[PDB]
C-alpha cells in the first residue's frame, strides 16, 4: 500500500496561518511549514512540524490566507485531514494537532510550549 | 503529638535539566524586569509556566545555573519531586515535566 489516492487535505487555523506568515517574514529562504509524523511510545506516532525551504518532489501543498503547509505522502495516510493550529498566549507558545480520526486526544498534559 | 503544617514541610524541591535551565535563562533575558518562571497546574490536569517579576510570599524558589523556577506552596505536594527538562521538536520549543508521581 503506497498513495495516487485524492485526500480531503489538511488545514492551517488563521491564528496557524498569521503566525506561520510572521515566520516565514523575519525569515529568508523560509517558504512554509511542513507536518511529518516520527515513530514514538508502544505503535505510536507523534506530529512534527518543521520551517521548510526546499520541498521534497512528493511533497502536498495546501494553501491558506499565504502560509504553505508542505506535507509529504508517506504521512496522508497516518493525518488526512488533521488542523494545524497555533496559541499564543502570555509565556506559552504552541503549534498543536488535531487529527479528526483521533478522538482519544491527549490527556497527559506533561507538557508546555514556549 | 502527631500534629503538623504542610506550609512548613521539607520538600525534595523540583529540578531542571541542564537545558531547561538555559531556555529559562532566555526567556528571562529576553523581557527586562523578568527574573524567572513560576512552574503551576490548570484545569485530567497540566502545567502551566508563568512569568515572574516580583515573586509572591508562598512560593518557593529552586535555582540552578543562574535560571529562578518558582512553585507555589499548594502545589508542592502535588508536584514535589518533579523534573523540568526542554527539548525541541520542530518548531516547538517545548518543556516537559516529569513528575515522579506521573
Redesign the interface.
Known amino acids: 500500500n503506497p498513495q495516487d489516492f485524492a485526500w480531503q487535505g489538511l488545514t492551517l487555523t488563521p491564528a496557524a496561518a498569521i503566525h506561520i506568515r510572521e ?1 516565514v517574514a523575519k525569515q529568508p529562504g523560509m517558504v512554509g ?1 511542513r507536518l ?1 509524523v516520527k515513530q514514538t511510545g508502544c505503535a505510536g506516532f ?1 506530529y ?4 521548510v525551504s526546499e520541498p521534497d518532489k512528493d511533497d502536498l501543498l495546501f494553501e491558506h490566507d499565504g502560509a504553505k503547509l508542505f506535507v509529504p505522502l508517506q504521512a496522508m495516510p497516518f493525518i488526512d485531514g488533521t488542523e494545524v493550529d497555533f496559541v499564543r498566549e ?6 498543536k494537532f488535531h487529527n479528526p480520526k483521533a478522538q482519544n486526544e491527549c ?8
Open positions: 515566520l511549514v511529518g507523534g512534527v512540524l518543521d520551517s502570555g509565556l506559552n507558545q504552541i503549534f490527556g497527559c498534559g506533561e507538557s508546555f510550549g514556549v
